[PDB]
Amino acid sequence: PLPKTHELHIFGSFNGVKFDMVGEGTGNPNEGSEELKLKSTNGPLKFSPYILVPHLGYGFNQYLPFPDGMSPFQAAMQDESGYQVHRTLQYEDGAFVTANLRYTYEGSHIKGEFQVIGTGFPPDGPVMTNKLTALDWSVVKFVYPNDKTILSTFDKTYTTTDGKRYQCTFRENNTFAKPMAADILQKQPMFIFHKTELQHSNNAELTFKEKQTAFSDM
Amino acid sequence: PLPKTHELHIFGSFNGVKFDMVGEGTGNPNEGSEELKLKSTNGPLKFSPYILVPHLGYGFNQYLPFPDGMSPFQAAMQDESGYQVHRTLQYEDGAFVTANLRYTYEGSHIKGEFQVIGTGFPPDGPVMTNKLTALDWSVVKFVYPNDKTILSTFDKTYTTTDGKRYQCTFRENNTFAKPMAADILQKQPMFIFHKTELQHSNNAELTFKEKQTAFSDM
Amino acid sequence: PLPKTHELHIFGSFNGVKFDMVGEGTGNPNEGSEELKLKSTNGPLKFSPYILVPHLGYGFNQYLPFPDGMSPFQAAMQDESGYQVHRTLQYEDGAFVTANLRYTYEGSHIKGEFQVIGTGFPPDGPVMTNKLTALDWSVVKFVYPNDKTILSTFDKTYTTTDGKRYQCTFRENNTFAKPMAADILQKQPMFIFHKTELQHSNNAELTFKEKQTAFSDM
Amino acid sequence: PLPKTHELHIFGSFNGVKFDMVGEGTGNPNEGSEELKLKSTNGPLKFSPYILVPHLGYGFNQYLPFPDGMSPFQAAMQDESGYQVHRTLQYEDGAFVTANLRYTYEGSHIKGEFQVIGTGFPPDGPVMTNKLTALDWSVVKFVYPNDKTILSTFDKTYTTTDGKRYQCTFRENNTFAKPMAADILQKQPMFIFHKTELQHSNNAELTFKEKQTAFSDM
Structure with a gap:
């Protein structure tokens, strides 16, 4: 089926120091909306929680419909053949993050196991000093080099407390076990408008919300 | 005033070999549409005319309105203070193009002088062997690091005769003589949906059309 | 002590398909030389073994001396405080590899656990069609953004059977538990000349050799 | 013949503001050394002169010998067939520089006409606030995609007064009118160790020195 609920185990390290969080959420696969509540399973995060935002669930594209039918993510959930996500993120100050997102399915429930590793963040930069204030709305481009x-x-940007934006070049592959349908492959590029919100009163517990909208035309 | 007509002198070199073209066009600054007819001032181009498409006029953003008023490009034309364009384009096969676009104004008429230099295109690649078939529709992201x-x-992609897309990472600065208005600076990022068409029966004469639409939300 | 011997478990996936190898080697920490023999723990690798070369042991920089004394890698082994390696590799055809290298120490013996994930390799590209013939000799640049x-x-290049090179932009962070010594930090940049050799007659059983030489001057 | 002397006209703009300098120099084509004295033809440069260092004469590789004979640059001067230089430089803070270097020859005298355009340098960044203190020694990599x-x-780095480095990714094509000799093409990659010095007490009058050494092995 299409998803209704999900859980996430997100873990890895930033600048060599481990982190680990767990949480659960919901979403509406007719509209590309999702919500997630997460908490650290040890102490508060030693880095800005905003650095995790694109890995939170964009992190569950099974909630994303396409304009005229299911997204390839949704189709791959429906027969449980699935897909894997691999990403590399290059920040303006030389730091980089790499990630691997993996899923299992139980009816309308998704379980995510996401490994996120970041290195090279300056100790005085906005990530390690908690100066990121929001993730800018984004347009993501999809092309399909093969089926x-x-x-x-x-291009991913955050606003920061001193007014400057903090930039990153984001690249991702989604690799499917079975071919995507012809009706998906026939419409390229596909764009996705992404909006996010993050609330956290401490660096230990987070509430995340997202809305995504696919479009190939205007 | 807003523009009605334009002319272009576009020149430079590809793989060390000079090219030079001139042409004229029109556009609708209420809708972000433009058309241009161009011809080589010597022989046919020795490279795919499609490689010039983003430099043709996106090349005249004075025809681009913003969602709630004039674009910064239009405002800068209205008092003739103007702006300059500088771009760097890195292709997947190691080649790169750099360009400088400059303008003068005479009432509602724009004159462009565009220098485009490309190097490192493989002699057997799709640019030098005329295998590009169209420029994919694009979404361009704008942020304003200062006023x-x-x-x-x-990310710029072309379709090619053998089915593969030909990729490029595009970066541009537009540098204004006078500050952009506060109402521009307050809405970031701004996105632009771009559609183009190119017709050419030989590599010597081209007809180009474009439609651009600014949006900050969906 | 300085290392004499090592073992490696290298694993991960390429284009979504798991691989796993184990092996053992030796090296000379006076000269930056190492040798490794590896065997797949399932069948032959489904991709060119040359794509792993950079992760085999550069993979054990505990064998690398510096010009005037121990490298930081060697110093970090001597007190077992250690370091972690994180890498991101962007190939010319859009594919990318990410990796995490981790070590444990037992006297003069090193154990490596290296996770290497690659995606987006075209099925007809040089990696998946065994076109890579050698890794070019390289010069690696080190700077130390903090202690x-x-x-x-x-810039990593392979020769190929198509008579062209296959290119990659390589970035890596080495993150140390304890600060590097002042004599290390005072000499920047540091360069490393790297030579490798790969012998194999099948894709399940590899023999790798390397020689590295550090230099800050000529 | 091999060069003994040179002159340079270097011009363009940074952040939309024109600059122009002229000067003269000498070098030793047996050793890859050169010296240049430059003066602004208007007032002092509005940006750090260190940002030009890479374009001063590496700027005259006709002074660079190769390990076993003339460099391709020297050979191309000997018959005056020549070469053109095109570069794109991406700085860490989003700014970029593009350049085109062109030469004419009169016996052992070279005349350079170098156009350098930079944009997007933050007004409070290291280039516009004179924080650059030296260009790090570099190793440049050459490969020959065709003859x-x-x-x-x-990777180009400067030291700065903030006690950090300021980074840039540098790419260049040298495009020759005639094929390079077989003895050049047969040895790849070729590496070049570069050292520079800049003396100035004001921003209108610069003294530049460089030493380059080619090597394919260690």
Whole structure:
């Protein structure tokens, strides 16, 4: 079926120091909306929680419909053949993050196991000093180099407390076990408008919301 | 005033070999549409005319309105203070193009002088062997690092005769003589949906059309 | 002590398909030389073994001396405080590899656990159609953004059977538990000349050799 | 013949503001050394002169010998067939520089006409606030994608008064009118160790020195 609920185990390290969080959420697969509540399973995060935002669930594209039918993500959930996500994120100050997102399915419930590793963040930079204030709205571009692969790109920017934006070049592959349907492959590029919100009163517990909208035309 | 007509002198070199074209066009600054007819001032181009498409006029953003009023490009034409365009384009096969676009104004008529230099295109690649078939529709992202500068980015792809897409990472600065208005600076990022068409029966004469639409939300 | 011997478990996936190898090697920490024999723990690798070469042991920089004394890698082994390696590799045809290298120490013996994930390799590209013939000799650049971090960069190229090179932009962080010594930090950049050899007659059983030489001057 | 002397006209703009300098120099084509004295033809430069260092004469590789004979640059001067240089430089803070270097020859005298355009330098960044203190020694990598083209790459860093480095990804093509000799093409990659010095007490009058050494092995 289409998803109704999900859980996430997100873990890895930033600048060599481990982190680990767990949480659960819901979403509406007719509209590309999702919500997630997460908490650290040890102490508060030693880095800005905003650095995790694109890995939170964009993190569950099974909630994303396409304009005229199911997204390839949804189709791959429906027969449980699935897909894997691999990403590399290059920040303006030389730091980089790499991630691998993996899923299992139980009816309308998704379980995510997401490994996120970041290195090279300056100790005085906005990530390690908690100066990110929001993730800018984004447009993500998808092309399909072959019938089992989506290449997704965007320029990711955050606002910060001193007014400057903090930039990143984001690249991702989604690799499918079975070919995507012809009606998906025939419409390229596909764009996705992404909006997010994050609330956290401490660096230990987070509430995340997202809305995504696919479009190939205007 | 807003523009009605334009002319272009576009020149430079590809792989060390000079080219030079001139032409004239029109556009509708209420809708972000433009048309241009161009011809080589010597022989046919020795490279795919499609490689010139983003430099043709996106090349005249004075025809681009913003969602709630004039674009910064239009405002800068209205008092003739103007702006300059500088771009760097990195292709997947190692080649790169750099360009500088400059304008003068005479009432509702724009004159463009555009220098485009490309190097490192493989002699057997799709540019030098005329295998590009169309420029994919694009979404361009704008942010404003300061009141006189737009940083524009996108992933640019062409379709080719053998089915594969030909990729490029595009970066641009627009540098304004006078600050952009507060109402521009307050809405970031700004996105632009771009559609183009190119007709050419030989590599010597081209007809180009474009439609651009700014949006900050969906 | 300085290392004499090592073992490696290298695993991950390419284009969504798991691989796993184990092996053992030796090296000379006076000269930056190492040798490794590896065997797949299932069947032959489904991709060119040359794509792993950079992750085999550069993979054990505990064998690398510096010009005037121990490298930071060697010093970090001597007190077992250690370091972690994180890398991101962007190939010319859009594919990318990410990796995490981790070590444990038992006297003069090193154990490596290396996770390498690659995606987006075209099925007809040089990696998936065994076109890579050798890794070019390289010069790696090190700078130290802070006392616990090395940022390593190079342009990585392979020769291929198509008579062209296959290119990659390589970025790496080495993150140390304890600060590097002042004599290390005082000499930047540091360069490393790397030579490798890969012998194999099948894709399940590899023999790798390397020689590295550090230099800050000529 | 091999060069003994040179002159340079270097011009363009930074952040939309024109600059122009002229000067003269000498070098030793047996050793890859050069010296240049430059003066602004208006007032002092409005940006750090260190940002030009890479374009001063690496700027005259006709002074660079190769390990076993003339460099391709020297050979191309000997018959005056020549070469053109095109570069794109991406700085860490989003700014970029593009350049085109052109030469004419009169016996052992070279005349350079170099156009350098930079945009997007933050007004409070290291370039516009004179924080650059030296260009790090570099190793430049050359490969030859075809017999008329050198692709040159390096990671370029400056030290700064903030006690950090200011980074750039440098890419260049050298495009030759006639094919390079077989003895050049047969040895790849070729590396070049570069050292520079800049003396100035004001921003209108610069003294530049460089030493380059080619090597394919260690």
